[PDB]
Amino acid sequence: MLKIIIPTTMLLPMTWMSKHNMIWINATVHSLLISLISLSLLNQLGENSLNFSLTFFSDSLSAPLLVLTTWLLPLMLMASQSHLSKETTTRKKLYITMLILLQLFLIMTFTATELILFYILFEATLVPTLIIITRWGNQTERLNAGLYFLFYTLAGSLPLLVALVYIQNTTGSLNFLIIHYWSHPLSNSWSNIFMWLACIMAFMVKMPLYGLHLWLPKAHVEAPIAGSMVLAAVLLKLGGYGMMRITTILNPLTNYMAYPFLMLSMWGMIMTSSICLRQTDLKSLIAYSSVSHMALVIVAIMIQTPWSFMGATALMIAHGLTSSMLFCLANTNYERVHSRTMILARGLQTLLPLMATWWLMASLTNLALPPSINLIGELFIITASFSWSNITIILMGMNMMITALYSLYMLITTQRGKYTHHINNIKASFTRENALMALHILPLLLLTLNPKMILGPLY
Amino acid sequence: IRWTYARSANIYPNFRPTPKTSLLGALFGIGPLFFWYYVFKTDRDKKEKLIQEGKLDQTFNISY
Amino acid sequence: DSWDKDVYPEPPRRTPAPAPQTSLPNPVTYLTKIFDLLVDRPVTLAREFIEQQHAKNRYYYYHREFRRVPDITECEEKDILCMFEAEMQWRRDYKVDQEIVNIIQERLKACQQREGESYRQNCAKELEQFTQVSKAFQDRYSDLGAHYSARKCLAKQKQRMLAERKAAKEAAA
Amino acid sequence: MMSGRPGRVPLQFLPNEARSLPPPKLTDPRLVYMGFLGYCSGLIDNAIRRRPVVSAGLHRQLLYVTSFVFFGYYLLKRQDYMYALRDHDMFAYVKSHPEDFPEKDKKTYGEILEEFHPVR
Amino acid sequence: IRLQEDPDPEDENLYEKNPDSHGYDKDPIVDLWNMRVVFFFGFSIVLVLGSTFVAYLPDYRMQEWARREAERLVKYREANGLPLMESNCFDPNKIQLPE
Amino acid sequence: MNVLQIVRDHWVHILVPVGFVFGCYLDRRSDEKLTAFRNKSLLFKRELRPNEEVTWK
Amino acid sequence: KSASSLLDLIWLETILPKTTSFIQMKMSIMVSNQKGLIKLYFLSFLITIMISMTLFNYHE
Amino acid sequence: HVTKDMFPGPYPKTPEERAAAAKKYNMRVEDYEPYPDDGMGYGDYPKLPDRSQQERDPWYDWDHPDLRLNWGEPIHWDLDMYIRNRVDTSPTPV
Amino acid sequence: MNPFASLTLTTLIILTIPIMMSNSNIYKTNLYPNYVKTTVSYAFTLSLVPLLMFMHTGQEMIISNWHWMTLQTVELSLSFKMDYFSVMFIPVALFVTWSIMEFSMWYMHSDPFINRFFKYLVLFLITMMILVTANNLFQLFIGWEGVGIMSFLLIGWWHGRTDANTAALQAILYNRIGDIGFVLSMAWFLTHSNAWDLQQIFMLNNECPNMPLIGLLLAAAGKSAQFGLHPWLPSAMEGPTPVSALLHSSTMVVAGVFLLIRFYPLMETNKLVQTMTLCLGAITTLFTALCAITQNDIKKIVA
Amino acid sequence: DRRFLKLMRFYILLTGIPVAIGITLVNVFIGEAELADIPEGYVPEHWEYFKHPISRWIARTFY
Numbered sequence A: 001m002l003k004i005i006i007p008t009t010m011l012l013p014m015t016w017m018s019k020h021n022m023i024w025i026n027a028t029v030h031s032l033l034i035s036l037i038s039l040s041l042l043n044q045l046g047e048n049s050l051n052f053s054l055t056f057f058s059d060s061l062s063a064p065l066l067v068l069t070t071w072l073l074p075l076m077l078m079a080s081q082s083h084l085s086k087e088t089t090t091r092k093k094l095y096i097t098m099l100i101l102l103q104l105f106l107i108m109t110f111t112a113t114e115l116i117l118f119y120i121l122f123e124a125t126l127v128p129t130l131i132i133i134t135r136w137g138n139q140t141e142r143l144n145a146g147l148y149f150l151f152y153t154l155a156g157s158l159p160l161l162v163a164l165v166y167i168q169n170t171t172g173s174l175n176f177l178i179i180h181y182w183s184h185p186l187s188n189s190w191s192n193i194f195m196w197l198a199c200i201m202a203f204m205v206k207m208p209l210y211g212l213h214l215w216l217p218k219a220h221v222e223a224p225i226a227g228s229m230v231l232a233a234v235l236l237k238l239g240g241y242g243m244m245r246i247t248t249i250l251n252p253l254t255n256y257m258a259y260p261f262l263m264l265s266m267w268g269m270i271m272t273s274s275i276c277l278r279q280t281d282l283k284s285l286i287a288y289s290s291v292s293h294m295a296l297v298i299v300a301i302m303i304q305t306p307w308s309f310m311g312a313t314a315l316m317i318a319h320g321l322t323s324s325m326l327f328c329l330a331n332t333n334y335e336r337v338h339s340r341t342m343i344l345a346r347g348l349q350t351l352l353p354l355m356a357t358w359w360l361m362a363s364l365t366n367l368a369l370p371p372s373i374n375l376i377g378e379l380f381i382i383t384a385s386f387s388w389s390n391i392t393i394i395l396m397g398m399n400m401m402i403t404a405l406y407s408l409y410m411l412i413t414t415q416r417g418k419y420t421h422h423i424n425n426i427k428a429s430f431t432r433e434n435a436l437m438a439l440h441i442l443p444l445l446l447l448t449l450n451p452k453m454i455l456g457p458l459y
Numbered sequence B: 001i002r003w004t005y006a007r008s009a010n011i012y013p014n015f016r017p018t019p020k021t022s023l024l025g026a027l028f029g030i031g032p033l034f035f036w037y038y039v040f041k042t043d044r045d046k047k048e049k050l051i052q053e054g055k056l057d058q059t060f061n062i063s064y
Numbered sequence C: 001d002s003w004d005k006d007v008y009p010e011p012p013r014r015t016p017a018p019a020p021q022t023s024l025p026n027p028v029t030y031l032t033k034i035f036d037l038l039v040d041r042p043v044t045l046a047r048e049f050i051e052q053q054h055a056k057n058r059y060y061y062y063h064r065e066f067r068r069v070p071d072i073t074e075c076e077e078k079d080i081l082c083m084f085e086a087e088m089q090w091r092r093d094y095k096v097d098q099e100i101v102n103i104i105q106e107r108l109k110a111c112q113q114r115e116g117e118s119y120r121q122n123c124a125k126e127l128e129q130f131t132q133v134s135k136a137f138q139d140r141y142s143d144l145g146a147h148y149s150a151r152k153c154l155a156k157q158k159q160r161m162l163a164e165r166k167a168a169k170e171a172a173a
Numbered sequence D: 001m002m003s004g005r006p007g008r009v010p011l012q013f014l015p016n017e018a019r020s021l022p023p024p025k026l027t028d029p030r031l032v033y034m035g036f037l038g039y040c041s042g043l044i045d046n047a048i049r050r051r052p053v054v055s056a057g058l059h060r061q062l063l064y065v066t067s068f069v070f071f072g073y074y075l076l077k078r079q080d081y082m083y084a085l086r087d088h089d090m091f092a093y094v095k096s097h098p099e100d101f102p103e104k105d106k107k108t109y110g111e112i113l114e115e116f117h118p119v120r
Numbered sequence E: 001i002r003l004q005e006d007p008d009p010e011d012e013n014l015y016e017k018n019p020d021s022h023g024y025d026k027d028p029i030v031d032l033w034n035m036r037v038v039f040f041f042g043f044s045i046v047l048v049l050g051s052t053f054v055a056y057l058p059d060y061r062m063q064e065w066a067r068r069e070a071e072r073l074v075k076y077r078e079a080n081g082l083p084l085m086e087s088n089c090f091d092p093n094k095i096q097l098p099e
Numbered sequence F: 001m002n003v004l005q006i007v008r009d010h011w012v013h014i015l016v017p018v019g020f021v022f023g024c025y026l027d028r029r030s031d032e033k034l035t036a037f038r039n040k041s042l043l044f045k046r047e048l049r050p051n052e053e054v055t056w057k
Numbered sequence G: 001k002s003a004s005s006l007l008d009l010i011w012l013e014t015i016l017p018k019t020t021s022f023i024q025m026k027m028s029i030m031v032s033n034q035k036g037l038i039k040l041y042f043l044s045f046l047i048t049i050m051i052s053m054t055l056f057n058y059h060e
Numbered sequence H: 001h002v003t004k005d006m007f008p009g010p011y012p013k014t015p016e017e018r019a020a021a022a023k024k025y026n027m028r029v030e031d032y033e034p035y036p037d038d039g040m041g042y043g044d045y046p047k048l049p050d051r052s053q054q055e056r057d058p059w060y061d062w063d064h065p066d067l068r069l070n071w072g073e074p075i076h077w078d079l080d081m082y083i084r085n086r087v088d089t090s091p092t093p094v
Numbered sequence I: 001m002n003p004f005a006s007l008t009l010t011t012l013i014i015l016t017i018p019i020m021m022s023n024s025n026i027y028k029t030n031l032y033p034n035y036v037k038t039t040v041s042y043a044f045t046l047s048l049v050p051l052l053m054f055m056h057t058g059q060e061m062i063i064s065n066w067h068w069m070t071l072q073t074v075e076l077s078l079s080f081k082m083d084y085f086s087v088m089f090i091p092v093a094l095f096v097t098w099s100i101m102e103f104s105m106w107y108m109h110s111d112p113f114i115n116r117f118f119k120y121l122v123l124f125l126i127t128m129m130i131l132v133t134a135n136n137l138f139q140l141f142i143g144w145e146g147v148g149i150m151s152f153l154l155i156g157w158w159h160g161r162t163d164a165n166t167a168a169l170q171a172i173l174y175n176r177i178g179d180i181g182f183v184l185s186m187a188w189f190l191t192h193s194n195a196w197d198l199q200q201i202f203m204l205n206n207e208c209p210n211m212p213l214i215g216l217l218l219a220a221a222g223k224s225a226q227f228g229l230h231p232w233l234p235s236a237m238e239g240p241t242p243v244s245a246l247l248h249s250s251t252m253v254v255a256g257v258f259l260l261i262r263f264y265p266l267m268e269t270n271k272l273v274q275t276m277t278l279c280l281g282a283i284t285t286l287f288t289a290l291c292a293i294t295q296n297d298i299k300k301i302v303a
Numbered sequence J: 001d002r003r004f005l006k007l008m009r010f011y012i013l014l015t016g017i018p019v020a021i022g023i024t025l026v027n028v029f030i031g032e033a034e035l036a037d038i039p040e041g042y043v044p045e046h047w048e049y050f051k052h053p054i055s056r057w058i059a060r061t062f063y
């Protein structure tokens, strides 16, 4: 699988040795090239995963993530074109290195064949993002933003490490294939429930879980524009991809003690969606809506119904995209006005009509309107939950109450309505914003026509 | 920007753990959760009381 | 008819014989006559075009067949070589078993619509034959979860097996 | 473990019986990474002394990689030797001590009874 | 003065310098360039040439293999009257039921 | 146009493809490292043909 | 109120992050800041000997 | 332009900070009624009567007639709660 | 067999053509309002040709022109329930739309977004008549929100009006309240009857569809504006009188009740389930007609 | 705004028409596969089993 790994490793000499003017022209022109190279990984067998080597392998679950990450990397490049034009060239090369290194650690992480190799490359991603969030951030609190990020993720990461080595000494291998074939029932002993607690709370923290979610509002809001998309789009989803992987040996204790988490997600998803409708900062909305959708997929894995694993993958990519346009859009209002208050800028179609067109179709994508894979994945979660419990619908049905209650709400107060006559700052839309808008939303309608590949391994 | 800082930032620097704040947090935090736990734990086992000695309909339920 | 009735049985074709005792020219028939002449014939010739050009070269495909492996039952415990084959074999059977209830569903789907309100009795055998397919499908696969496995399938099969074996002994009385 | 191994000679980088093991290849990925590590020391040295970080002191860089490769190559010989030594008394102990190491007549899944957990 | 600091710089509107700007760089020749890069592969071969690749996967997950096989198997047991697939697959002959 | 400037403007481009095709080699190089069961997988013990050597490279 | 001001902005942010970070902060100065006079330092060494030798009695 | 004072600080206990916080929200000294101070987090912010943005004078030359706002004048903590699109606090005939 | 399906399937195709000319902007501004007028008009006149087949033959038939994916035992396919309910609803519907949008271009004549409006009407039929032709309940749901989020856009024809934006909020809210039961029916259908096809749902003979018909009854309450979720039509009148005439007179409100009559093979199976339909329906008639007894407008009384 | 719109479809159509005419050519110029039975003599290659010429093409070179 070094088809994709090495050219990204080499991309660091590429950007570092590139000339003064190109750099970003260089950075994109080859990151797109790597994207179609990673588009090859769409070749799955039925159920036997693509085992490329002893340490690297991929399956129907990992591959959609790989294409998401690799194709994402050009997007923050062009997204960061505006924000970081003033800075000198050397840090420009360093910033791209952080982006490439981040995507580098992502692709190996999703493709590791040994659990600890996944873990070492799991939390290896906070190191570059901590640099991105803290150094290149904009507002003052960004200092405390990074601390909240790493400490939250680490507070659960270390228990996983102690658990992982324990399984190594107990079973003899943490490799996905061996642990899957030699999967054994995790008994109900108090020792084993804490083992389950160790192997789950790590992903739950950066899931996030209701109550264990403060980092995203304190990080995504003050993260740099490029950094903000990457966190929500994919760096949310390491825990998820790990979660469906480690859940092969935690049975049957999962069906017995997932209730507190199924609780905290269900109430949290309504709670997060409701508070999402009542923030004064637009950037907090995509952050709070993100966890609301993200709280949904934790429900999927807990019931571990085949249908639940169906929508877990689809919603992951769907939301992972969905947060991307909104953060891109929410960015576009910011630097134009140097504020993230939706109240300050209202009715932008009277000034930016094309931006509004992109705004609404991303919004209705967040609405989970079929045939978009946002709904079908999200819908499969509903069906699995009903199989788990018929009553489940009402609490989550309350989530199909708040989403559109806010997901069109900023539309009618950011892109829709009248304009304040004092902001002459608002200007025409540079084609970059619409162009990246095109590569952002056009895919989601494209693979909508063909949902089986991003459906997941349960096909 | 006085309002924006107020609505988000000023809360905890001015927050004080009064007894009523704990009660409201209880009946809006752990409280509603236990509501969902008791209702969801019940029907779940109520379903589990159905399957074992065969009193549940599974004529078409082959998409578990 | 690239398919065949043994897998896809369909009701026989019985059409009425209209006797237009009326005098008004039947507009419906004239709409067909203009339709086949104006619409079918040109696209048919285009369809007749794609025939012999497809006939000037006809590369053949063949079926992909797999030799039946020893099952997990004879697969040695904790063994990893012959576990591979039996796990592969079971999952293909899993994918196989989904497509046959699909085929019965498709047969079920066609039975109602093509037989109108008479499907209440015309699908009586079609309705009954699904139930044995579905119930046996559940006995093959049920409550296996996302991480289903050939071992777990046998564990369920065993779990049912001694329960009925003990019940049969109890039924002996 | 193995400082108490019989015949062990302290202060001896590579003992004689180590040579019976396959010497690490020149293109061994771990070896070439050690060379890549030597390269990375080259950039930093030019960086600390604020010299052209890519074209200054190529002689320094050439020494900075070759020295890492040499100490690398010898280190991997020792690395393989200890793992081979650990695997040696490994199989010496299993053969000389049969009773303490039972080989259970493991039997296929058709004869075992693993409980099925009905998930839902 | 306290902290000697520069005045806050004003946003450089790309369109005022060249009113054919693209939000890519100051220099127009590189600016029109950066479009021809993204409006190259980005939309051209990642989406369009990408779509034909992903939409033309050779038998992704062999669902057609199961299909024609499912057609193939059902006629066999329907020809000799067997009720196609059976409640159990690991047939009773080779398993070892306890006691 | 002068050869030196085209090197001094467009030379980092030509390295990304060869970096990729380099990877293809180790992917091929990795393949024979684990031949192991060469034509003794149960599905694929097809009888050897003299024209070739084994089922796959 | 119940969403941001009560629970999210305060309560969940009070229990785990603020309180635990306070605990680190609270007893740091009890253990980090010390008087610096030489006498008490070796005086502290004293009782360490007995508790090691007598209280838990690592010898037994 | 905005360093430290404008943002809410503590609850203005004393009359001196009562007047300073009244000046902080550019209101008069006498009409300044800060929010109740009991584990509430509002502090400097004043009590705003339930007057929605639909209820305000639609014939006034508002700087922002979107929700009938002006420039510089104080703003309700729950402003977005009661705006013309959302819930309204307006008189009814009965 | 040769005719019937291909003709009406062309109707779905041919008035989608105005849309992807509109995106390609091959329309020369003022030509588009008349251009779509023509295409809808032939879409009418062609729709009678399948209709004439129904008066004489009376036959109906379901088309599955595409297969989306196979969820193990569920193979979602592009299935169309083409029948008497489907075919005859076509000509009456869009001829009414063709009739009104002419009155629109005379009325709606000054706002320079004539084309943007007219295409907005054009895709509106596309989502409508796919509901009445849809066979799998998923396809019906696709059109269910399709009209719903598009009523939001259409009634919000003027972003200057904040009442319009306000009106859309409850219009989507009440519509969203309805489709919760649609999800509930979907959830029940996907678990219990494990199917999506309307033909499959009824032909399983689910004689105890308590939870589904509760969901469909809830679905009507939003779409068909029953009691509780009535006042969104008193809100949707703010959208231009043409489009208000087009959507919120009888063209997409009936989709909710048409859903129940689609489910008629299982709608009336439970006598009790019938009962609160009469209950929900009766209170609307008393309440809504009471409201129209005094209305100082010319829109509320009709609604 | 309109400039970005027309050229973005221009670039989409730039490489879209060649694959559009290509996909039309393959199913109307060089045929589609049909089922057969191996006469037990020719070793069937992996890309041979497949339906569409492009499907066998991609499998032959990229699989």
Ligand SMILES: CCCCCCCCCCCCCCCCCC(=O)OC[C@H](COP(=O)(O)OCCN)OC(=O)CCCCCCCCCCCCCCCCC
Residues within 6 Å of the ligand: A029, E029, E030, F005, F009, F010, F011, F013, F014, F017
């Ligand atoms: C395969 C090898 C690839 C690398 C070697 C070949 C590179 C050229 C490839 C063909 C390019 C065709 C278009 C050429 C336009 C030239 C415009 C021009 O002259 O710009 C020059 C200028 C730099 O200054 P100067 O060179 O001094 O000239 C101006 C002096 N006043 O201003 C500039 O900014 C110059 C920028 C021009 C960039 C041209 C494209 C570079 C990238 C090409 C490869 C991209 C794909 C890589 C992978 C290919 C294989 C898959």
